[PDB]
Write a protein that binds this DNA or RNA. Structure first.
Ligand SMILES: [Zn+2]
Lengths: 132, 25, 221, 56, 217, 101, 83, 71, 129
RNA sequence: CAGAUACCGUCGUAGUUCCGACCAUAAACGAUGCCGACCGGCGAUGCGGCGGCGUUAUUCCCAUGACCCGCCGGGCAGCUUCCGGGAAACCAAAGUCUUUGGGUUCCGGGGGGAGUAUGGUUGCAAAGCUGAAACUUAAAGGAAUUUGGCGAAGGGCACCACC
RNA sequence: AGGUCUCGUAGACCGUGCACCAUGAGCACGAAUCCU
C-alpha cells in the first residue's frame, strides 16, 4: 500500500516543528517550501514529505498532535494551566461532616467548629459488589 | 516392550517352568 | 586517551577532592566507571585469566559459538574482584571481563588465630559462600600454614591477600564459574559479619555528595 | 564511516574457514554502493595454499 | 515536627482537609497502615487521623529542607491527576519534575540522555508508580510517597497518609508540602498568610475546561 | 514434571468421585475432571423464528428453549475446539472467556 | 581491629543500621542514609545542624522502614510524643 | 542420623551394619562367591599353558583385529 | 509432643533475631532457660528479660538487640570432660576469639571459660556467638 | 488393509448384581511418614461460639430461622511476595541445614541381569511376602532456553500452490 | 387537541465426528590470546 517510512515521517515532523508560519494547506506551496529550506536529493521523497506535511497540518488545525510541539499551541496550554478562580473552591460557606470523624475531631484538638454540621448515617451497611 | 506386558510374559514363562518342574518328578 | 566522567562521582574523583575508595566503600556507592579503580589502584592491580569456556547456540544452519572468559583481579594486600564476559571472539571477551572485574572489587578484612601479634594473615571467621550447588567454606588457620585448597581458590586467595586458610568445598566443583563465584561470595561476605570486636555504636559522617555539592554545582549542570 | 575486512582460505587447519571483521557502517544494495565503497580482491601465496582478501 | 507550638494546624488547615476530603480513604486496608487509621465508619470507608498526617508531612518537609541543593529533589508523577501539581511544586521549591512517562533506566543507565542522579525522591502513588521505586532501590536513594490506605507500603521511608484518588486532595497535599518546605527554607514568612491560591495544583478534565471557557471569557 | 498446581481436576479431599460418560465418545471420565458446557439453545435459531411467529394460532407466543448439559472428555473437548492450549503464564487463569452478547 | 599493641589495623569501620543494628555492606545498594533537618525553637527555621539515620537494605526490601524512621524520630524528639 | 538419643547405639550400629552390607564394592570383597568365580583365586599373577592363538575384534567405533590367546 | 523446652526457646529467639524483631515470647519457662539467658545477658548479647508469672508456667519476653548471630542446642546432653572440650570448641565455634559453649556443671550453669579456670566439666547445653 | 486373528459395525459365553467362603494386589499418588514449636499479608469458604446499625417470617416486645458487618478455634483449598530453600520446575513448606543435633519408624547407594534362580512361607487355584549371584556396560538419568518436526493450534503469503 | 413516543440495529453460533497413509544401514565434526 502507501505507508510512509522513518525518513519521511521524521523529516516532516522536524520541518513542522521548526517551521509553521511558512507552511500551509496547499500541497504545491509547502512542496516549494520543502524544496527551498530542506536539502532533498530526490523528488519522490520531496513529494512524500510535502504530502505528509499537508496531512499533518490537516490534523493540527483540527486538534492537538502528541508527536510534535509548535509555539502557537504551546503556551495556550500554560494559559490554560495558569488560571485562577474567584472563589478558592475550598473555603465554602458550609462543609458536610460525618458523625464518626466529628467525634474524631472532638478528641483531636477542638470541641466545636463554626462551619460544620453533623449529617445522619445510613440505615444499613451494603458497600461491596456481589462477588461471594 | 513396555513393563506390563513384559511382566505378563515372564509370568507365563514362570508358569510353564513350574508346570515342567512339577511334571519332571 | 582522556577521561570524560559521566557520573558526578567520577568528576569528584578526577578533580582530586576524595582521599581513598574506602569512603566510597563505607557509603556503599555504586561504581560504574571501571578506571576510577585504575586511578586509585595503580601497578599493584594484576589479573590472571581463569578459564575460557566456549558456549554454543544452535541456529538455522550450524551452531553459533561464543567464548566466555573468566578473569580475577586484585592487589595482593587488600581488594579482590571477579568478572565474567561472553562475546564473539576471545580478545574482546577478555577485555570486557577485565573491565567487569575492575568494576566490582570488594574489600577484605583479615583476623588472627589466637594471639593478635603483628599484621593479620587469616580469615577472621568461618565464612561461607553459596551459588549453584558449590558450597565453599573458609576456616582460619595458624601462621605459616599456607592456602590449602583447590588451585582456583588458592590463586584467588593469594590474589586477595589472605595468606593462611583452611578450605572445604562440596558439590560439583568441576564447573569453574560456580566454583569461582562461590569462593568470591565466601570472601566478599567477610565484612558482613557482626563480631564483638566492633560492637561500639558508630558515628555517621557526612556523605561526599552533600559536602562537595558546592563543587558539583560550580563545575557542572 | 565504516570498513569490512574478511580473510578467506585455510587458517591453522586442513578445513577452510572464513573470519569476517566488520565495524561501522556498510551498505550493500542500491546504486549508492557503486560510488561510495571501493572493493579490492587480492591473493596471498602462502606455503600451504592461497589466501583470499576482500576489503571494502 | 510538631513538638513545638508553632508547627500545628490552627483553624484553616483542618477546614481545607475537610473540604478536600483527605480524611476519607479506600475500602481496603494494608497491614502497615493500621497506625494511620482512627476508625472505620459506615459504608466501608476508613478515616485517616489528621494529626498523624500533619506529623508525617512535617517530617517529609524536614527531609526535603535537610539537603541544601534544591535541584537534587526529583518529583515524579505519571497519572493525569497530579500532572500540574508536580510542575508547580518544582516551580516553587526548585525541584526537578518528571510528569508523564517515567522511562526506565534513568537512574541506572548513564548513556541515556535523561540520566538523572538525585538525592531525594518524591512520588505520588506507590501502587501506580512501582517503576521509580525499583530504580530508586537499585542505587542508594531514599524516597517520599503520598500513600493511601491500601497502597503497597514497600521501599518507602516517609509515608504520608492521604487521599490520592481525588484531584483536590492531591493538589492540597502538594500545596501544603510546598508551603511547609518554603517556610522551613525561610523564603516565606510564617505569620503572614501565604494562602494566595491553592487551586493552581488542581487538575480538571477537559469537559470542565470547555465548560469553564464557555462560562467565562 | 508437574504441569499444574492441581492435577487437571478439582479433587482435593475425596480420593474417589463418580465417573461419568462423554457425549461424543463413551469414555468413562471422572465428574470433576470432564469439561462441562451447559448450553441454552432455542428450538428455531435465527430465521425460522419469524416463520413460526407469522404463521401461528396464538398471538404473542414465546418460543420455548432447549436445555442440555454436555459432558466432554479432554481429548474430545480439544478435538471439538472447545478448549485450546495456552501459554505457561496464561495457564493459571481460571476466569471464563469473555462474552459480547 | 586491634592487637596486643592496641593499634588499629582494619581498613574501615563499616556503618551499622540504625533500625536493626546490622552491618551495612559495601555492595548493599538498597541501603540509604537519611538526613533529617531540625528547626529553631521560636522562629522556626533551619538552624544548620543534621540528624542522620541509616536503614539497611533488608528493612527497605521488607518494606517496614517508615515505622523504624518514625520510631527513631520519636526517640530523638522530632515527632511529638502523643502523635 | 535419624535415631538421635543418648542410649541409642545398638540401633545405629545394626542399621549401619545392614546398610554397609547393602552395597556393591564392600559386598564383592566379603562374599566367597566373587572369589571362587574369579579364575585367579585372589592372586595377582597366574601361570598357564597356551592352547591356541585366537583373533578377536574391536567394538563399534574403531576397527582392528586385537590378537589374543586361549590359556 | 513437646520434649525439650530450651530447644524451642532458642529456636524462637533465633527466628525472631533473623526476622529483625525487637521482642519475643517464649511460652514455657524453666530454670535452665533463665540461667542460659542470664549467661547470654551477662556476656552482653541480649537485654533485660521479663518473666511473666502465672500459676502454670511462666512466659519470658527478652529485649532483643542487634547483637546476636545464632543460638542453638546440642541434643542429647552429651557429657564432656576437660580433655574433650577442645574438640567441641574447635568443631562448633567460628573463631578462637569469641563465642561461648554453655555447659551444665556441678558448680552451676556456666560457660566453657570459667569451666576451664574452675577445673571442672559436665554435660553440654548449647552455644551462641 | 498388501496382510488385520487390530481401530469400526451385528450377535454373544464367563463376568457385571445379591448372599456365603477365599487372595491381599493398583499411577492404593499430595509420586511429599507421624507428633510438637516458630517465622508475612489478603479476600472468600464449611462447622461451632460471641458481638453489633438495619431488612424479612407483614407493622409493638423477646428468643429464634434467613440476610448485612466483624472476631475467635479446628478443617479442604486459593492469590501475591528478593522471608527463606532448591540443580531448577517450584514450595508458606519442600523454610528455620557448613551459623550442620526437637523426638521417632520405614527405606536408596551407576545402569542391566532382576523382583530373576534356589530355599522358606501363605493360598483350592491364579498368585502374594521374603529375595541373590555369575556375567556385562560408561553411561542410564532430573530441570530449562533458542533453529527440529507434529496426520498440534491460532494469524498471514505465493499461479515455481490451488480454485 | 396532537397521531408510527425516543436513541443504533453483527437481525453472524445448522451441524457433529471426518477413508487409506509402512520404511530410511551410514561412513562426515576442527573447540582458541597478546600488540610499539
Ligand atoms: Zn468422548
Amino acid at each position: 500500500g502507501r505507508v510512509r517510512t522513518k525518513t519521511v515521517k521524521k523529516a516532516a515532523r522536524v520541518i513542522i516543528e521548526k517551521y509553521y508560519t511558512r507552511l500551509g494547506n496547499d500541497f504545491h506551496t509547502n512542496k516549494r517550501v520543502c524544496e527551498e529550506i530542506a536539502i532533498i536529493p530526490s523528488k519522490k521523497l520531496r513529494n512524500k514529505i510535502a504530502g505528509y506535511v499537508t496531512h499533518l497540518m490537516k490534523r493540527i488545525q483540527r486538534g492537538p498532535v502528541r508527536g510534535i510541539s509548535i509555539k502557537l499551541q504551546e503556551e495556550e496550554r500554560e494559559r490554560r494551566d495558569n488560571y485562577v478562580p474567584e472563589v478558592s473552591a475550598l473555603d465554602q460557606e458550609i462543609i458536610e461532616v460525618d458523625p464518626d470523624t466529628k467525634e474524631m475531631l472532638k478528641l483531636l484538638d477542638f470541641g466545636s467548629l463554626s462551619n460544620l454540621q453533623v449529617t445522619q448515617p445510613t440505615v444499613g451497611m451494603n458497600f461491596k459488589t456481589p462477588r461471594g | 516392550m513396555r513393563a506390563k506386558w513384559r511382566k505378563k510374559r515372564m509370568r507365563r514363562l514362570k508358569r510353564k517352568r513350574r508346570k515342567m518342574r512339577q511334571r519332571s518328578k | 586517551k582522556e577521561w570524560l566522567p559521566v557520573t558526578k562521582l567520577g568528576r569528584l574523583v578526577k578533580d582530586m577532592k576524595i582521599k581513598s575508595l574506602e569512603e566510597i566503600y563505607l557509603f556503599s556507592l555504586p561504581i560504574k566507571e571501571s578506571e576510577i579503580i585504575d586511578f586509585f589502584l595503580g601497578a599493584s592491580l594484576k589479573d590472571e585469566v581463569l578459564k575460557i569456556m566456549p558456549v554454543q547456540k544452535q541456529t538455522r544452519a550450524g551452531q553459533r559459538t561464543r567464548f566466555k572468559a573468566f578473569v580475577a583481579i586484585g592487589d595482593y594486600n587488600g581488594h579482590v574482584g571477579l568478572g565474567v564476559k561472553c562475546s564473539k571472539e576471545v580478545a574482546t571477551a577478555i577485555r570486557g571481563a577485565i573491565i567487569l572485574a575492575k568494576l566490582s572489587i570488594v574489600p577484605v578484612r583479615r583476623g588472627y588465630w589466637g594471639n593478635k601479634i603483628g599484621k593479620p594473615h587469616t580469615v577472621p571467621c568461618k565464612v561461607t559462600g553459596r551459588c549453584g550447588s558449590v558450597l565453599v567454606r573458609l576456616i582460619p588457620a595458624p601462621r605459616g600454614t599456607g592456602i590449602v585448597s583447590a588451585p582456583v581458590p588458592k590463586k584467588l586467595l593469594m590474589m586477595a591477600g589472605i595468606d593462611d586458610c583452611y578450605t572445604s568445598a562440596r558439590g560439583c566443583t568441576a564447573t569453574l564459574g560456580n566454583f569461582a563465584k562461590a569462593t568470591f561470595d565466601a570472601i566478599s561476605k567477610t565484612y558482613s559479619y557482626l563480631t564483638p570486636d566492633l560492637w561500639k555504636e558508630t558515628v555517621f559522617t557526612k556523605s561526599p555528595y552533600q559536602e562537595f555539592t558546592d563543587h558539583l554545582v560550580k563545575t557542572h549542570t | 564511516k565504516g570498513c569490512e575486512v574478511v580473510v578467506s582460505g585455510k587458517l591453522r587447519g586442513q578445513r577452510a574457514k572464513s573470519m569476517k571483521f566488520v565495524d561501522g557502517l556498510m551498505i550493500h544494495s542500491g546504486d549508492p554502493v557503486n560510488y561510495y565503497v571501493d572493493t579490492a580482491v587480492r591473493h596471498v601465496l602462502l606455503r600451504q595454499g592461497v589466501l583470499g582478501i576482500k576489503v571494502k | 515536627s510538631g513538638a513545638l507550638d508553632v508547627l500545628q494546624m490552627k483553624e484553616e488547615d483542618v477546614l481545607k482537609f475537610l473540604a478536600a476530603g483527605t480524611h476519607l480513604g479506600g475500602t481496603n486496608l494494608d497491614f502497615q497502615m493500621e497506625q494511620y487509621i482512627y476508625k472505620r465508619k459506615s459504608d466501608g470507608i476508613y478515616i485517616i487521623n489528621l494529626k498523624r498526617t500533619w506529623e508525617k508531612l512535617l517530617l517529609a518537609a524536614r527531609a526535603i529542607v535537610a539537603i541544601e541543593n534544591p535541584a537534587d529533589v526529583s518529583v515524579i508523577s505519571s497519572r493525569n491527576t497530579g500532572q500540574r501539581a508536580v510542575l508547580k511544586f518544582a516551580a516553587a521549591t526548585g525541584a526537578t519534575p518528571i510528569a508523564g512517562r517515567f522511562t526506565p533506566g534513568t537512574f541506572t543507565n548513564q548513556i541515556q540522555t535523561a540520566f538523572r542522579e538525585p538525592r531525594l525522591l518524591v512520588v505520588t502513588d506507590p501502587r501506580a508508580d512501582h517503576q521509580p521505586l525499583t530504580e530508586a532501590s537499585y542505587v542508594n536513594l531514599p524516597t517520599i510517597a503520598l500513600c493511601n490506605t491500601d497502597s503497597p507500603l514497600r521501599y518507602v521511608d516517609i509515608a504520608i497518609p492521604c487521599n490520592n484518588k481525588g484531584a483536590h486532595s492531591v493538589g492540597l497535599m502538594w500545596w501544603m508540602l510546598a508551603r511547609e518546605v518554603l517556610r522551613m527554607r525561610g523564603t516565606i514568612s510564617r505569620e503572614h498568610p501565604w494562602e494566595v491560591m491553592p487551586d493552581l495544583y488542581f487538575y480538571r478534565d477537559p469537559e470542565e475546561i470547555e465548560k469553564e471557557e464557555q462560562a467565562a471569557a | 514434571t508437574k504441569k499444574r498446581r492441581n492435577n487437571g481436576r478439582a479433587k482435593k479431599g475425596r480420593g474417589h468421585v463418580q465417573p461419568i460418560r462423554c457425549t461424543n465418545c463413551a469414555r468413562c471420565v471422572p465428574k470433576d475432571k470432564a469439561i462441562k458446557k451447559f448450553v441454552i439453545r432455542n428450538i428455531v435459531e435465527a430465521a425460522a423464528v419469524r416463520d413460526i411467529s407469522e404463521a401461528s394460532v396464538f398471538d404473542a407466543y414465546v418460543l420455548p428453549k432447549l436445555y442440555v448439559k454436555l459432558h466432554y472428555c479432554v481429548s474430545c473437548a480439544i478435538h471439538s475446539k472447545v478448549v485450546r492450549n495456552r501459554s505457561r503464564e496464561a495457564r493459571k487463569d481460571r476466569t471464563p472467556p469473555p462474552r459480547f452478547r | 581491629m586491634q592487637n596486643d599493641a592496641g593499634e588499629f589495623v582494619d581498613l574501615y569501620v563499616p556503618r551499622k543500621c540504625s533500625a536493626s543494628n546490622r552491618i551495612i555492606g559495601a555492595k548493599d545498594h538498597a541501603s540509604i542514609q537519611m538526613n533529617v533537618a531540625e528547626v529553631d525553637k521560636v522562629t522556626g527555621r533551619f538552624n544548620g545542624q543534621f540528624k542522620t539515620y541509616a536503614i539497611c537494605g533488608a528493612i527497605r526490601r521488607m518494606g517496614e522502614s517508615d515505622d523504624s524512621i518514625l520510631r527513631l524520630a520519636k526517640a530523638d524528639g522530632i515527632v511529638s510524643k502523643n502523635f | 542420623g535419624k535415631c538421635r538419643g543418648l542410649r541409642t547405639a545398638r540401633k545405629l550400629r545394626s542399621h549401619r551394619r545392614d546398610q554397609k552390607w547393602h552395597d556393591k564394592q564392600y559386598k564383592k570383597a566379603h562374599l566367597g562367591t566373587a572369589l571362587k568365580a574369579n579364575p585367579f583365586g585372589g592372586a595377582s599373577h597366574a601361570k598357564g599353558i597356551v592352547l591356541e592363538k585366537v583373533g578377536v575384534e574391536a567394538k563399534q567405533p574403531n576397527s582392528a583385529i586385537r590378537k589374543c590367546v586361549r590359556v | 509432643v513437646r520434649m525439650n523446652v530450651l530447644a524451642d526457646a532458642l529456636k524462637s529467639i533465633n527466628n525472631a533475631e533473623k526476622r529483625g524483631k525487637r521482642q519475643v515470647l517464649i511460652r514455657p519457662c524453666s530454670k535452665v532457660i533463665v540461667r542460659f539467658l542470664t549467661v547470654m545477658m551477662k556476656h552482653g548479647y541480649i537485654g533485660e528479660f521479663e518473666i511473666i508469672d502465672d500459676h502454670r508456667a511462666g512466659k519470658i519476653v527478652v529485649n532483643l538487640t542487634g547483637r546476636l548471630n545464632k543460638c542453638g542446642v546440642i541434643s542429647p546432653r552429651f557429657d564432656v570432660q576437660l580433655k574433650d572440650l577442645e574438640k567441641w570448641q574447635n568443631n562448633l565455634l567460628p573463631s578462637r576469639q569469641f563465642g561461648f559453649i554453655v555447659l551444665t556443671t556441678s558448680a552451676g550453669i556456666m560457660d566453657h571459660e570459667e569451666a576451664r579456670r574452675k577445673h571442672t566439666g559436665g554435660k553440654i547445653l548449647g552455644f551462641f556467638f
